[PDB]
Amino acid sequence: HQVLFQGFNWESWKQSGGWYNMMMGKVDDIAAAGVTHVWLPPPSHSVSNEGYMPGRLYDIDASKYGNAAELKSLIGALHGKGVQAIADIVINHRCADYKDSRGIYCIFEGGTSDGRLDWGPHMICRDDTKYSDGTANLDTGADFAAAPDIDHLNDRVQRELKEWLLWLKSDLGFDAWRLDFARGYSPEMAKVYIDGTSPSLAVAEVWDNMATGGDGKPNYDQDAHRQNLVNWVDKVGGAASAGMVFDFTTKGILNAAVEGELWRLIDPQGKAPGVMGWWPAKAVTFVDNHDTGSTQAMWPFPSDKVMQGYAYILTHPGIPCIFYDHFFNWGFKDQIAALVAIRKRNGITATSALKILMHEGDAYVAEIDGKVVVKIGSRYDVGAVIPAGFVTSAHGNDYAVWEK
Numbered sequence: 001h002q003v004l005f006q007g008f009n010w011e012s013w014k015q016s017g018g019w020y021n022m023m024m025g026k027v028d029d030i031a032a033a034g035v036t037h038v039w040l041p042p043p044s045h046s047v048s049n050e051g052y053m054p055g056r057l058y059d060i061d062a063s064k065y066g067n068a069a070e071l072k073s074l075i076g077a078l079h080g081k082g083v084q085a086i087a088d089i090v091i092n093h094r095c096a097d098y099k100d101s102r103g104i105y106c107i108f109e110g111g112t113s114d115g116r117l118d119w120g121p122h123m124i125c126r127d128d129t130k131y132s133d134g135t136a137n138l139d140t141g142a143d144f145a146a147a148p149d150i151d152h153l154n155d156r157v158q159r160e161l162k163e164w165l166l167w168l169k170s171d172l173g174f175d176a177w178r179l180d181f182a183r184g185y186s187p188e189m190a191k192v193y194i195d196g197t198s199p200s201l202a203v204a205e206v207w208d209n210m211a212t213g214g215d216g217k218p219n220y221d222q223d224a225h226r227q228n229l230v231n232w233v234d235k236v237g238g239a240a241s242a243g244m245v246f247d248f249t250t251k252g253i254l255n256a257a258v259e260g261e262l263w264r265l266i267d268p269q270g271k272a273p274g275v276m277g278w279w280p281a282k283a284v285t286f287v288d289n290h291d292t293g294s295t296q297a298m299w300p301f302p303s304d305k306v307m308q309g310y311a312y313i314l315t316h317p318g319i320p321c322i323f324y325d326h327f328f329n330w331g332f333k334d335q336i337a338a339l340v341a342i343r344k345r346n347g348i349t350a351t352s353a354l355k356i357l358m359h360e361g362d363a364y365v366a367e368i369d370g371k372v373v374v375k376i377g378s379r380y381d382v383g384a385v386i387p388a389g390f391v392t393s394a395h396g397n398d399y400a401v402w403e404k
């Protein structure tokens with residue numbers, strides 16, 4: 001049994017009294033909902049309030065989310081309920097606190113009295129000429145324009161970041177990682193940190209653009225997109241590795257599929273069309289996150305069909321990740337809890353068997369592990385396709401779930 005929960009949104013840093021402190025009052029509901037892992041925001045001091053422009057990595061007390069004490073309390077509380085904590089690891093780039101003799105912000109400060117993470121421009125990818133001194137290695141991945149990109153090929157960088165990561169575990173209590181902008185560096189570099197810090201899991205944000213047709217809608221065939229993701233997992237270590245990926249392929253397809261085009265939810269082989277269909281054990285599914293939904297809304301899920309999104313991921317293979325807003329602010333708390341209960345009660349896991357029974361425009365009906373049947377779509381009657389012995393267990397707007 002494994003169910004992730006993103007414990008924050010793009011507005012969380014603004015929370016009166018501290019986000020982590022507020023979250024203490026949410027722990028019980030999250031645990032009772034069957035959640036096993038809670039993804040928390042970048043914990044270190046960051047130039048940007050949301051934390052995605054970290055500077056002093058060890059300076060937890062400078063976070064807009066709360067200080068080290070408050071964070072440890074939250075993680076302690078989650079652990080008290082058997083829930084693990086995933087830290088949002090942002091290491092592709094990093095902001096330098098001080099200027100060098102060139103007037104360039106490239107003198108880093110780790111947050112401790114010694115030289116830990118006290119890097120200089122030699123640790124900045126040389127091809128990031130806005131900050132580099134030309135002495136480092138070339139970036140192993142894409143660049144983040146607003147800040148120095150870190151040369152992960154640098155020996156000291158690997159050593160110290162790994163030491164820091166282990167510190168997040170031993171000192172704060174974190175159990176696993178969420179790798180931010182993993183396209184910023186190679187899967188080989190991700191391998192170094194994953195293999196070197198033994199997290200329970202390391203879900204990477206490998207976000208590639210999804211191919212679309214002349215009408216702007218994603219193509220039915222998204223194999224190129226999920227193949228990239230499968231390849232990333234293979235290169236990071238495959239099955240043996242704790243590494244995994246957010247199922248963006250499923251996210252893009254599902255975004256479109258619910259708009260009366262549920263025929264998109266199956267490939268020519270009869271499997272789920274996203275990563276879920278090729279490597280479910282490595283596919284972390286989701287309806288929306290702080291980037292796609294929330295106040296950034298880069299790729300929101302049709303707001304009137306969100307619960308269909310959850311009926312889908314919460315009953316299917318792959319590791320579903322619930323979004324904070326949907327659970328506490330949209331009023332789906334009880335329905336989402338009930339869907340997880342169904343998943344758990346039936347022993348459904350990321351690798352459960354998926355047998356799709358119907359995949360028409362306004363009706364998708366699938367059977368998981370021969371124990372749970374789920375349906376989404378505007379078509380009301382699908383009773384003819386419901387296997388014998390199944391009885392409705394949960395239902396809502398354009399979705400229903402049966403149990404046997």
Ligand SMILES: CO[C@@H]1O[C@H](CO)[C@@H](S[C@H]2O[C@H](CO)[C@@H](S[C@H]3O[C@H](CO)[C@@H](S[C@@H]4O[C@H](CO)[C@@H](O)[C@H](O)[C@H]4O)[C@H](O)[C@H]3O)[C@H](O)[C@H]2O)[C@H](O)[C@H]1O
Pocket residue numbers: 375377379380381382383384391392395396397398399400
């Ligand atoms: C008005 O608001 C609406 O609320 C609705 C209920 O939540 C949903 S419909 C939603 O859930 C439905 C199940 O409650 C299914 S219909 C689905 O399941 C049915 C029950 O197993 C069967 S059989 C059922 O038998 C009744 C007694 O014999 C009979 O009177 C009914 O006509 C018959 O449905 C049915 O065959 C099967 O299709 C929907 O598919 C789900 O979408 C609305 O979405 C929501 O707007």
Ligand SMILES: OC[C@H]1O[C@H](S[C@H]2[C@H](O)[C@@H](O)[C@H](O)O[C@@H]2CO)[C@H](O)[C@@H](O)[C@@H]1O
Pocket residue numbers: 227230234238277278279
């Ligand atoms: O199932 C785990 C398996 O996943 C892939 S093999 C994958 C291939 O990438 C895809 O093009 C083809 O259509 O389906 C197969 C099976 O899902 C990975 O490469 C491999 O290491 C892993 O064992």
Ligand SMILES: OC[C@H]1O[C@H](S[C@H]2[C@H](O)[C@@H](O)[C@H](O)O[C@@H]2CO)[C@H](O)[C@@H](O)[C@@H]1O
Pocket residue numbers: 303304329330331
């Ligand atoms: O905003 C349009 C949308 O509004 C609700 S969905 C959702 C809303 O987006 C969110 O800001 C708020 O926190 O929760 C509501 C649901 O409780 C409406 O249900 C939907 O039909 C409409 O399209």
Ligand SMILES: [Ca+2]
Pocket residue numbers: 109110111112113114115116118
């Ligand atoms: Ca220092």
Ligand SMILES: [Ca+2]
Pocket residue numbers: 093128143144145146147148149
């Ligand atoms: Ca950069």
Ligand SMILES: [Ca+2]
Pocket residue numbers: 181
């Ligand atoms: Ca980003």
Ligand SMILES: [Ca+2]
Pocket residue numbers: 092139140141142143144149150183184185
């Ligand atoms: Ca980079």
